[PDB]
Amino acid sequence: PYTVVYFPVRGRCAALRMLLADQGQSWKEEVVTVETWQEGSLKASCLYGQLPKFQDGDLTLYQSNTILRHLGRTLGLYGKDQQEAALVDMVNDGVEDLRCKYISLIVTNYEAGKDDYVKALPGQLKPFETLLSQNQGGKTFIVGDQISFADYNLLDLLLIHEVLAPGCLDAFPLLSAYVGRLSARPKLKAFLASPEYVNLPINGNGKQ
């Protein structure tokens, strides 16, 4: 069974939770208070001193993208073949890059950086619109014709950017329609509407 060990935020666990919910998998949440984290003991035991920590039976993993790839591999959300698997990675790596820029903004430079960030945003989102346009006219998934862990990550990234810069997908019809389509998947829709998702802040510092 699966355990997610994280702070009481959506953050870097939002995509992997969406994945698990949408795939109908059961899991446990272990919540780490800022104070438990400050004590230092748990942090010292984490491979790279960070959360999330994830348990799959006796397998303990760190790094949100390691967890996504693991779930992608085990649950068959990693493309139909080797070529698609590579494209799934290429998408997820691009999502991670933009996520890192988003995190940097939220944590270190929200006030002085937001305008610079939002104006730079369309150029950062365009590659995903491009990928969609080259795959069945953008009517299905980011890679190929079945959902992948990259879809869940990309979906999260887009949802949080809509909160940051409302209407930012107006310039991107395929990304816009993709957000609506994936968000409407019944198990995912239910999860996104649920107190367990809605009552967590996006980020620890309460900015979004």
Q: What residue ranges bind its own copies (CB under 8 A)?
A: 47-48, 59, 61-63, 65-66, 69-70, 73-74, 82-83, 85-87, 89-90, 93-94, 97, 100, 127, 130-131
CB-nearer residue toward its own copies: 65 or 203: 65
Residues in the chain: 208
Residue 124 Cβ, how far from its own copies at the closest point, in Å? 9
Binding-site residue positions for glutathione: 6, 12, 37, 43, 50-51, 63-64
Residue 203 Cβ, how far from Ca ion at the closest point, in Å? 16
Spacing of C-alpha 120 from chain mean position: 20
DSSP H/E element including 148: none
Find which of Ca ion, its own copies, none residue 76 binds, CB within 5 to 8 Å per kind.
Answer: Ca ion
CA 192 vs CA 41, 44, 162: distances in Å: 33, 33, 15
Q: Which amino acid is at 151?
A: D
CB-nearer residue toward its own copies: 134 or 199: 134
Find which of its own copies, Ca ion, none residue 163 binds, CB within 5 to 8 Å per kind.
Answer: none
Residues of the shown chain interacting with Ca ion in the complex, contacts defined by CB under 5 A: 76, 97, 146, 167, 170
CB-nearer residue toward Ca ion: 78 or 117: 78
Residue 185 Cβ, how far from its own copies at the closest point, in Å? 25
42 vs 50: CA distance, rounded Å: 9
CB-nearer residue toward its own copies: 101 or 189: 101
108 vs 104: CA distance, rounded Å: 6
Residue 206 Cβ, how far from its own copies at the closest point, in Å? 25
DSSP state of 46: S
Find which of its own copies, Ca ion, none residue 90 binds, CB within 5 to 8 Å per kind.
Answer: its own copies
DSSP state of 94: H
CB-nearer residue toward its own copies: 3 or 63: 63
Q: Which phi and psi angles does 24 have, rounded to 5°?
A: 70, 25
What per-residue string of b and e applies to 48-61 under the rule 16 or more CB within 10 Å gives b? eeebbbbbeeeeeb
